[PDB]
Structures are given as structure tokens and as C-alpha cells.
Amino acid sequence: SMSVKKPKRDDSKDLALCSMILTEMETHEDAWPFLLPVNLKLVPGYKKVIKKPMDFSTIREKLSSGQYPNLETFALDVRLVFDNCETFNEDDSDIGRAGHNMRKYFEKKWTDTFK
Template identity: 45%
Template sequence: MQCTMLRKVGYLVTKEIVAQQREAILAKVRQMSKSRIVYEGLPQFQDGKGEGLVIDPKDVPGLRESGWMPNMNVPASPSTKNFERSAMESILSDLQAHPQAWAFKEPVNAQEVPDYYDVIQNPMDFPTMEHKLETGQYQNLDVFIADAQLVFDNAKVYNPEDTIYHKGAVKMERLLMDHVSRVRKIS
């Protein structure tokens, strides 16, 4: 039994066709590449005593031919999304996904809870933390953790211990501390 999709294609010889294409590509790469050229090493390093020696990159044989340019000597800028930033994003995402997070997903509504802002001088919630994270306002993990802790401290200060808000804050605080201890072990 045979199935033909394109009559031009010899399906029985595809292996040979692919091998020919591969060889053609490799031949073109070999033609353009100068990787087979081996340059003499610098004499300063021949005896193994060149440690700490500063040399001009222009003096390195073959460096220019490889495509090097002086502007490539500038050190790469550090990644804007470093380990701490990734950790903060992960922690906040996990906190927001927790079943107890519903109470912290929006700022407290002053019309629904009129005295809240009289009692709580420094309010904090997950959307505010998310905004601060997105706009680069957290200089480090400790500042981020302080804001997360503030969310739960505020809930515990304002609400009596037997309320769902206080109990939820305690559970969320434990989750935060678990994440923080894991991150600190890694870093």
C-alpha cells in the first residue's frame, strides 16, 4: 500500500536527500568558517607565568579575524531579572494562589470597614505588592518580605484571633516563611 502526498517527492529516498542537504550545508559552513586556523599562543603565556598580566586584545593573534571589535570589550550588563526578582515573583504568585489569599487580594475598602485606616497606619495588600514588584520598587528580597509580613501583621492587628481573617493571616504567614527559608537555602 502506498500514500503519496506530493508526486515530486521521492519518499523512498528521503534519507539520501536529507544526507545530501546536510552535506551541502556543512560544506558551505566549512567554506565560510575559519575555525580550522590555529594561531600561535602569546609568548607572555608560554612559560605559565602570565597570570595577572594585562594585554591589549588587539595583540591576540586571530582575534580581529574572528569578528572581535573593541566595543565588545564592555562587560555585559547584569540581568534585570536576577535570582531575587524571580524568587519574589514566585513567592507572590504562590501567596496569591493560596485558598486563604482571598482576604488580601484587594485593598481594604474604607466604606465597608470605616475604622480600618484609623487603626492600620501602613496598609498593604497583594495588588500593591505586585505593582511594586513590576515597577522595580523592591531593592531586595528583605524589603519584599517586609511588605508581605506587613499584610499579615495588619490582618492580625485589626482582627480578633477567632476571626477567619486572623486565622488566614497566620496560615499565609507560615506559607511565606516556608518559601523564604527555601529561597535562603538556595541562595
Template identity: 40%
Template sequence: MQPSRRSHRRSQVLDQSLPLDNAILQDLLMELIHHKDAWPFLRPVQKAQVPDYHLIIKRPMDFGRIKNKLNMLVYVHNSEFIADTLLVFENCQMYNQSEAEEYKAGARMSRFFRKRCRQLGLQIPDEANPPPAKKPRLSS
């Protein structure tokens, strides 16, 4: 008998050196969902409401999709959850003008998310490996 996809995925999670911290991520996602600035990110952007969104944004993401993926054990590593969450804010910045309320809400949410990740000991890829400091120029 073949193991089910779900049991195979579960064994993959257990085999990883850095397993998914599901409980921590569930709590963090609930904080994000209940944040006062979460309103633009709770559900997918509807084509009927924003016709050009999917022409500009090639990988849409929202908190509802993230919650579903977390609940269905799609994520194997914390970094996958973090990447999807950062994608929400990147898409927001790419699509919206800086004076738009959605853009401002996304910027505040991004700062909040990054701060909470640091507090929880979750590494954000661009913060885990900061660019090396520039070497001073040697004058000849």
C-alpha cells in the same frame, strides 16, 4: 541628558551586593496570591466596607500593591518585598480578633510564607537574627 529614574533605579539594583531576585519573588508572590487563604489580602481594604481600618492600620499593604511594586521595580532588595509581605500579616493580626476567619487565614498564610522563604533561601529578618540565648544565672 539626565538619566531617568527607572534607569537610575536599575543601576542601583545592579550595584547592590544582594540584588533583588525578581523571578523568585514573582513566583513566590503568585504562590501567595493563589493560596486558598489569600482572599483577605488580594486587594486594599476599602474604607466603605471597613470604616475604622485606616484609623487602626497606619501602613496598609496587600498582595496587589506588592505585585505592583515588584512589577514597577520599586523594590531594590529581597528584604523590602519580605517586609511588605510580613506587613500584610502583621496588619491582619493587629486589626482582626483571633477568632475571625481573616485572622486565621493570615496566620496560615504567614506560616506558609515563612516556610517557603526558608525553602527558597530567603532570609526573614526576625529569623535571620534570633535573640541570643539567656545566660544562666549565677547563684551566690
């Protein structure tokens, strides 16, 4: 509350460390469905169904231009990429499996870097 604060967690390396995580997600062999925005002209149903499209290149641009206020808003966009994937793709598909694999890979790196 006013003039009553928990001890200050060092957040000075968060930007660099989110960048490293994102680099590792970008270079994973199963990243290919997620590297670029879904083409809304060429994929029937995507525009109407997925209210907030997100992909790795859009996260990279937001990160590089100071559009993440803190590490949690960064995690929320990464998770959105996988939530969107699950909304649109069957579990038993190459893309559906890719999204599950990448979500796992992310959540471990997130826990190990920050928890």
C-alpha cells in the same frame, strides 16, 4: 568598610524568585482577605488604626515596577500584610486564621528559597 567586601552573593534571580513566591501566595485558597486593598470607605476604623495598609495586589504592582530595592524590602511588605491582619482581626475568626496560615506558608517558602 572601604575596599573591604564580603564575597558577592548572587542576587540576579531574586526578582524572579520573589515573583514566584507571590504567585504561590496569590493562588492559596486562604489568600482571599489579602488579594486587594481593604476598602477604607466601607470598613469603619481601618483608615485610622492601620497606619500602613498593604495587600498582595499592591505588592505585585510594586514588584513589577521596580519599587523593591532588594529582597528584604519585599519580605517586609509581605509581613506587613499579616501584621496588619493580626492588628485588626481576632485570632478566632476566619480572617484571623487565614492570616496565621498565610504567614506560615510564606515563611517556609522564604527559608527554602533563600536560607
